[PDB]
Amino acid sequence: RDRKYLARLKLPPLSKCEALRESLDLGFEGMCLEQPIGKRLFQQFLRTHEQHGPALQLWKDIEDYDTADDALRPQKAQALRAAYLEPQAQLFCSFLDAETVARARAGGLFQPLLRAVLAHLGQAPFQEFLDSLYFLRFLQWKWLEAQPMGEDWFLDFRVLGRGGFGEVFACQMKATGKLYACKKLNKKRLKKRKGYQGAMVEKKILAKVHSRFIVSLAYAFETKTDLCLVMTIMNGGDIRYHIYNVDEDNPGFQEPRAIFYTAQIVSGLEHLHQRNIIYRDLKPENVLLDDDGNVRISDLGLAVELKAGQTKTKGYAGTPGFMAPELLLGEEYDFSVDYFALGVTLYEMIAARGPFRARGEKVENKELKQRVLEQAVTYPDKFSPASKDFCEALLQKDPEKRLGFRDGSCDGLRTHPLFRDISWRQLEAGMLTPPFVPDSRSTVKGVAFEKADTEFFQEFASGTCPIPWQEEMIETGVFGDLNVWRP
Amino acid sequence: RDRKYLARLKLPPLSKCEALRESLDLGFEGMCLEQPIGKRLFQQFLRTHEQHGPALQLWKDIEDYDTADDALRPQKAQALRAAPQAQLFCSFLDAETVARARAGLFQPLLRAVLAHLGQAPFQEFLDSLYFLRFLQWKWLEAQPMGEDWFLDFRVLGRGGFGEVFACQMKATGKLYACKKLNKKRLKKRKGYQGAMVEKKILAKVHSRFIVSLAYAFETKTDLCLVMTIMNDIRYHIYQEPRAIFYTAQIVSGLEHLHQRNIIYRDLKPENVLLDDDGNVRISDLGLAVELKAGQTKTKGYAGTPGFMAPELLLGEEYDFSVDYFALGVTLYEMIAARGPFRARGEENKELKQRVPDKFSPASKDFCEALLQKDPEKRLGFRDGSCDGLRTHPLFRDISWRQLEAGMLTPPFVPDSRTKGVAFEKADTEFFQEFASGTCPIPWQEEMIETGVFGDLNVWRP
Numbered sequence: 001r002d003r004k005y006l007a008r009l010k011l012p013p014l015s016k017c018e019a020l021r022e023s024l025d026l027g028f029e030g031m032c033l034e035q036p037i038g039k040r041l042f043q044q045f046l047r048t049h050e051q052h053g054p055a056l057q058l059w060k061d062i063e064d065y066d067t068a069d070d071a072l073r074p075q076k077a078q079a080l081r082a083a084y085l086e087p088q089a090q091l092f093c094s095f096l097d098a099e100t101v102a103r104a105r106a107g108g109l110f111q112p113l114l115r116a117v118l119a120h121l122g123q124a125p126f127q128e129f130l131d132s133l134y135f136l137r138f139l140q141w142k143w144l145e146a147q148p149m150g151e152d153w154f155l156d157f158r159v160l161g162r163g164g165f166g167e168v169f170a171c172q173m174k175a176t177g178k179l180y181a182c183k184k185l186n187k188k189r190l191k192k193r194k195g196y197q198g199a200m201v202e203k204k205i206l207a208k209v210h211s212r213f214i215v216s217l218a219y220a221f222e223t224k225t226d227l228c229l230v231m232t233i234m235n236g237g238d239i240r241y242h243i244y245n246v247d248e249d250n251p252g253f254q255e256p257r258a259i260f261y262t263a264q265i266v267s268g269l270e271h272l273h274q275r276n277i278i279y280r281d282l283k284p285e286n287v288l289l290d291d292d293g294n295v296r297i298s299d300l301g302l303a304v305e306l307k308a309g310q311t312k313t314k315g316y317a318g319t320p321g322f323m324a325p326e327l328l329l330g331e332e333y334d335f336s337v338d339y340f341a342l343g344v345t346l347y348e349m350i351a352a353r354g355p356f357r358a359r360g361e362k363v364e365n366k367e368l369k370q371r372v373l374e375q376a377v378t379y380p381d382k383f384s385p386a387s388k389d390f391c392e393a394l395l396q397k398d399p400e401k402r403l404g405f406r407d408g409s410c411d412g413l414r415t416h417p418l419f420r421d422i423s424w425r426q427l428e429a430g431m432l433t434p435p436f437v438p439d440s441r442s443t444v445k446g447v448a449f450e451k452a453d454t455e456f457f458q459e460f461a462s463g464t465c466p467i468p469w470q471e472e473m474i475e476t477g478v479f480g481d482l483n484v485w486r487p
Numbered sequence: 488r489d490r491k492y493l494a495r496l497k498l499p500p501l502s503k504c505e506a507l508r509e510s511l512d513l514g515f516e517g518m519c520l521e522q523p524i525g526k527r528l529f530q531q532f533l534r535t536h537e538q539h540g541p542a543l544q545l546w547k548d549i550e551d552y553d554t555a556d557d558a559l560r561p562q563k564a565q566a567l568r569a570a571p572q573a574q575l576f577c578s579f580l581d582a583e584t585v586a587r588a589r590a591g592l593f594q595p596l597l598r599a600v601l602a603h604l605g606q607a608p609f610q611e612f613l614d615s616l617y618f619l620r621f622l623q624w625k626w627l628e629a630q631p632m633g634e635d636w637f638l639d640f641r642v643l644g645r646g647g648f649g650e651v652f653a654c655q656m657k658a659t660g661k662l663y664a665c666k667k668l669n670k671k672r673l674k675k676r677k678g679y680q681g682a683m684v685e686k687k688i689l690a691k692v693h694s695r696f697i698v699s700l701a702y703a704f705e706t707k708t709d710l711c712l713v714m715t716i717m718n719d720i721r722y723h724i725y726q727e728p729r730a731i732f733y734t735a736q737i738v739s740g741l742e743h744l745h746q747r748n749i750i751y752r753d754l755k756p757e758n759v760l761l762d763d764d765g766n767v768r769i770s771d772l773g774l775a776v777e778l779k780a781g782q783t784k785t786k787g788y789a790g791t792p793g794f795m796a797p798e799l800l801l802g803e804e805y806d807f808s809v810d811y812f813a814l815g816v817t818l819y820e821m822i823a824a825r826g827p828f829r830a831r832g833e834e835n836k837e838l839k840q841r842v843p844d845k846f847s848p849a850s851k852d853f854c855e856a857l858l859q860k861d862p863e864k865r866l867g868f869r870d871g872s873c874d875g876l877r878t879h880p881l882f883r884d885i886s887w888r889q890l891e892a893g894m895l896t897p898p899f900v901p902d903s904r905t906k907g908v909a910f911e912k913a914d915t916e917f918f919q920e921f922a923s924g925t926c927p928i929p930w931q932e933e934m935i936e937t938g939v940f941g942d943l944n945v946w947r948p
């Protein structure tokens with residue numbers, strides 16, 4: 001917490017909030033439920049006013065119930081049925097409508113109630129909250145957020161890795177002291193290699209999606225030399241390395257780890273596939289690992305957001321030996337190309353070598369294509385009968401008979417027997433402990449800048465992003481330090 | 488704290504404060520310095536912002552210094568002088584005034600601390616959540632709190648037009664005196680002009696030696712006044728340090744009245760009440776008179792027999808000097824258990840003509856000063872103060888500073904185990920203009936006192 005940069009984070013007077021009150025889109029779903037500080041302040045309100053008292057505590061205890069470890073769950077539910085649902089009880093929710101109330105005296109979830117309760121809280125109490133000091137403080141924070149936080153605010157302190165157009169650094173947000181990854185894209189070297197359309201898609205995606213299994217874009221700015229991206233740091237390296245450079249002699253992961261890492265990659269893929277995006281570049285080496293032992297997918301630079309009401313899209317692009325046959329041919333394909341790759345990853349994780357390819361036989365794109373479009377998958381004796389069946393499903397060629405995304409979900413994939421020792425609820429939660437925690441050991445000249453480029457660079461350098469900023473603020477405990485009334 | 492009436496005390500939404508923002512007069516001197524919750528919220532702001540950090544603590548430690556017991560005082564001052572290039576050094580202080588502190592009273596430093604705080608930091612504060620909360624409170628205050636909110640629980644005494652009750656503010660549970668004036672019995676006895684002057688005065692002045700008007704409303708039968716309860720010097724007669732102490736307060740109360748151009752006119756033991764702590768406050772202002780804007784002296788015959796000064800008894804241009812004369816009669820009657828001019832158990836024209844070894848040489852000389860006839864050679868109010876009275880030798884074992892404060896031990900704590908009338912618009916119109924309602928400062932006190940301000944001024948439990 002560097003004193004000078006920390007002292008910059010200071011709430012503004014109320015007159016500097018006019019503009020936001022209008023300019024801000026924020027209504028309920030976004031403000032009080034989606035945004036960390038908004039949820040915080042909205043609940044601080046609900047807390048301090050007695051009428052909402054029960055609705056808040058019912059709202060909280062449902063959340064706690066959903067992230068409750070299996071062996072507690074049914075106990076907590078009993079206690080919750082008592083505190084908030086029992087007729088003529090102390091914190092009895094009266095606003096709940098008979099039908100919905102008596103429904104929650106049956107069950108293995110409390111999902112109607114969260115809808116029923118937030119439907120309420122968003123209606124009137126939200127309006128009471130809008131006409132309150134808390135709301136005004138909420139703006140105060142939305143302002144502080146909107147202030148400029150560029151390359152000044154980030155101390156680059158280590159090299160996490162080399163990328164295409166520049167080094168990915170590890171860095172600390174000078175003010176709050178939170179460690180981020182800083183992916184730096186050289187301005188000239190982008191232009192020269194005609195990579196705008198990529199670099200941008202990545203910025204647009206990472207900042208658009210928020211999920212624990214994708215890297216999260218926190219900040220995005222330019223320098224006079226590079227376009228930087230600040231994103232959830234991933235010290236743990238990447239799945240490729242952690243096959244071939246952990247126990248070099250005894251290669252690859254054991255089945256529970258391979259499954260667990262797939263589990264997250266699947267959940268991350270789903271999130272992308274629910275928002276009509278094709279990852280297109282799935283492979284171990286772009287599936288990063290955090291300090292805690294969990295994974296997140298990365299390098300969206302060759303992703304593609306399918307268009308508003310678009311079933312499938314064309315385009316040739318990807319990694320050799322990970323590209324699905326229907327793509328390799330060059331036809332109308334959809335999400336099913338990613339799941340194909342997923343299987344190659346789950347194969348290579350366990351086997352320490354690609355499915356179709358041997359180790360040390362690097363070859364032609366037309367040769368490997370034939371090896372994809374026409375070859376049967378051989379599975380060694382390291383596999384279990386569950387894993388073999390899973391991979392086969394993902395590694396088929398025909399996308400109308402390949403396991404993947406169906407009817408808004410992957411639940412058809414999740415039921416597959418391979419996922420026995422898995423609590424999907426907790427996986428999406430964060431509770432589930434990972435099995436393995438890590439511990440690891442100029443240019444040419446020609447392209448000068450024009451007006452037409454810089455307008456992109458600024459449209460790239462969006463700035464600080466709402467939710468991940470608000471997290472950092474609460475995370476680092478600067479929100480506490482600042483959201484104070486009577487010391 | 489009656490749950491139903493306590494639950495009425497609830498801060499309003501910010502939309503119900505627009506009106507007050509304009510309708511309220513409140514600027515700095517009044518808001519942040521004079522009003523309890525305003526002072527509170529203004530300080531909470533100063534506290535939560537780092538830049539003002541020192542100025543708030545200097546501002547607090549000066550206050551604490553002024554109310555500091557003699558034997559600590561100079562120690563605290565040294566510590567305060569400590570707290571150039573220092574940790575919480577006030578930089579905004581101007582070199583000249585900065586020196587003063589060393590070259591010794593920190594009265595003019597406070598006057599330059601507040602000069603600052605009221606300038607810019609106040610403007611920062613007006614553009615803050617704390618100011619908005621301040622209005623929230625000013626609104627709750629302005630809501631109607633009539634005869635509903637007061638449980639009458641005992642009779643403190645009988646008055647002219649009705650019984651003075653002891654009562655509790657149902658919501659916060661604070662004990663008040665409830666002086667009830669019967670509407671018909673006022674009118675019939677032509678007492679409006681009086682009853683009103685009293686309401687106007689008690690609510691106008693705020694001092695620890697005068698009763699304080701908290702609320703004032705009407706019922707369908709009476710005009711009520713809620714005021715600082717006082718569970719009287721007359722009864723408590725029928726020693727010199729006590730007589731002096733009681734006078735000391737009565738003088739300080741009289742000064743406050745005399746600095747605001749008012750003559751009490753009805754000074755006598757029996758209307759100088761005593762609180763549970765053992766301190767006194769003057770009372771029954773009904774025959775007072777606020778001298779007019781740029782008015783030296785006023786006429787009028789009114790007062791209590793054997794307490795009225797000669798220059799008044801004649802009927803001439805008189806001023807505050809009539810009160811001080813009475814003061815002396817009170818100090819005489821206190822020590823002697825009998826009036827000065829009059830014996831025990833013995834006409835207005837006779838007493839007018841008329842207008843021991845228990846005394847000390849200091850008391851005798853004080854009384855004689857107050858009990859002289861000629862008001863141009865009588866001890867009293869001079870050039871904006873009574874300091875000429877305060878220096879008189881009778882006030883030896885007296886720390887005036889602490890007397891005004893509240894610190895000084897009272898030399899005696901009491902015992903805690905002791906038809907034919909019709910109304911018109913012209914009347915009702917008065918009764919409403921009498922029934923003003925709840926009063927800013929004393930209300931805001933009650934709220935902090937009873938700790939409902941804490942319970943309500945909450946942010947994150």
Ligand SMILES: Nc1ncnc2c1ncn2[C@@H]1O[C@H](COP(=O)(O)OP(=O)(O)O)[C@@H](O)[C@H]1O
Pocket residue numbers: 160161162163164165168181183215231232233234235237238285286288298299301
């Ligand atoms: N958020 C991150 N945390 C830790 N390391 C990262 C992060 N992002 C990238 N890296 C490292 O830097 C390398 C290059 O990043 P990448 O985005 O894959 O470059 P490119 O977009 O040119 O493919 C990766 O192989 C990885 O090891």
Ligand SMILES: Nc1ncnc2c1ncn2[C@@H]1O[C@H](COP(=O)(O)OP(=O)(O)O)[C@@H](O)[C@H]1O
Pocket residue numbers: 643644645646647648651664666698714715716717718719757758760770771772773
């Ligand atoms: N605040 C109080 N607390 C307790 N008793 C009081 C209080 N105020 C007045 N009393 C008692 O009630 C009596 C009537 O009030 P007072 O002002 O004397 O009536 P009037 O206005 O007719 O002179 C007083 O003499 C005193 O004994």
Ligand SMILES: [Br-]
Pocket residue numbers: 132133134498
């Ligand atoms: Br509020």
Ligand SMILES: [Br-]
Pocket residue numbers: 179
């Ligand atoms: Br580190």
Ligand SMILES: [Br-]
Pocket residue numbers: 321354355356357
């Ligand atoms: Br392969």
Ligand SMILES: [Br-]
Pocket residue numbers: 011615616617
């Ligand atoms: Br504020």
Ligand SMILES: [Br-]
Pocket residue numbers: 484485486487945946947948
């Ligand atoms: Br607080």
Ligand SMILES: [Mg+2]
Pocket residue numbers: 163286299
């Ligand atoms: Mg890469």
Ligand SMILES: [Mg+2]
Pocket residue numbers: 164299300301302
């Ligand atoms: Mg890339």
Ligand SMILES: [Mg+2]
Pocket residue numbers: 757758771
């Ligand atoms: Mg009386």
Ligand SMILES: [Mg+2]
Pocket residue numbers: 647681685771772773774
């Ligand atoms: Mg009277």
